[PDB]
Design a binder for this molecule. Structure first.
Ligand code: HEM
Ligand SMILES: O=C(Cn1ccnc1)[C@]12C[C@H]3C[C@H](C[C@H](C3)C1)C2
Length: 214
């Protein structure tokens, strides 16, 4: 529809369905993730969020992004650093995997942030609004699958401490997406970039599934 938030949701419905059908996601939802698989996911998220959040910081003052700049509410890099120190130990930064599908996603994030920051909102939407949607249900499926020690670390990623109500925040973020001023041409490019963002996630999950069969 007219609102960017509605147009994004409509335009990405098909690719979101593709994501729901992905082998890795079917497995994840059914509690079939192993510690190895979960670690790969966390490492992937770290690389992705490092790049996204670097680009957000670069562009935070620009009219094409400032309205959707919510650093305290949304930032995930620090939580992922905490979790990776648990999952991979003190040398995590040296030992975490960085695979081609992770690299392709990072590469696109930097291209967008450096050369077409007007499309960064498509990437922030796809990452943050999705990741905020797996409330306690996704954390618990993982928690049951992983059988973690009682050491109070490893799942920080699944809690956004600065957002009390996901619905409340999501409605605000949608409004801010809708506040963005763009030409019809740019709006179309933003929609296409959200599809690209979903496709980069789908390709990532396909690669991770392939790595886990070896
Ligand atoms: C396990 C597979 C998945 C399931 C079962 C699932 C399910 C859902 C559900 C039920 C919502 C609620 C929509 C809302 O009210 O906001 C949602 C939102 C969302 N999902 Fe997923 N999802 C999956 C994978 C993905 C993936 C891989 C992405 C890519 C980043 C993604 C991106 C999003 C986004 C951006 C939203 C917010 C939509 C909006 O409100 O505009 N999802 N998802
Ligand atoms: O499905 C999600 C987030 N999510 C929830 C609803 N739509 C997207 C992920 C986010 C993040 C942690 C786990 C595995 C993978 C990467 C996908 C659940």
């Amino acid at each position: 529809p007219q609102d960017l938030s509605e147009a994004l949701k409509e335009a990405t419905k098909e690719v979101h369905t593709q994501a729901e059908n992905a082998e890795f996601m079917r497995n994840f939802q059914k509690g079939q993730v192993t510690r190895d698989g979960f670690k790969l996911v966390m490492a992937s998220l770290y690389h992705i969020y490092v790049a996204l959040e670097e680009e957000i910081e670069r562009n935070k003052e620009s009219p094409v992004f400032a309205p959707v700049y919510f650093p305290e509410e949304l930032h995930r890099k620090a939580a992922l650093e905490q979790d990776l120190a648990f999952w991979y130990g003190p040398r995590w930064q040296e030992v975490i995997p960085y695979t081609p599908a992770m690299q392709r996603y990072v590469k696109r994030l930097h291209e967008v942030g450096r050369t077409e920051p007007e499309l960064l909102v498509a990437h922030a939407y796809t990452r943050y609004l999705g990741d905020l949607s797996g409330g306690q249900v996704l954390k618990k499926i993982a928690q049951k699958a992983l059988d973690l020690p009682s050491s109070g670390e490893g799942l920080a990623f699944f809690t956004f401490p600065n957002i009390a109500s996901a619905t409340k925040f999501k409605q605000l973020y949608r409004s801010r997406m809708n506040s963005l001023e763009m030409t019809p041409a740019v709006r179309q490019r933003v929609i296409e970039e959200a599809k690209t963002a979903f496709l980069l996630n789908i390709q990532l999950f396909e690669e991770l599934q392939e790595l886990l069969t070896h």
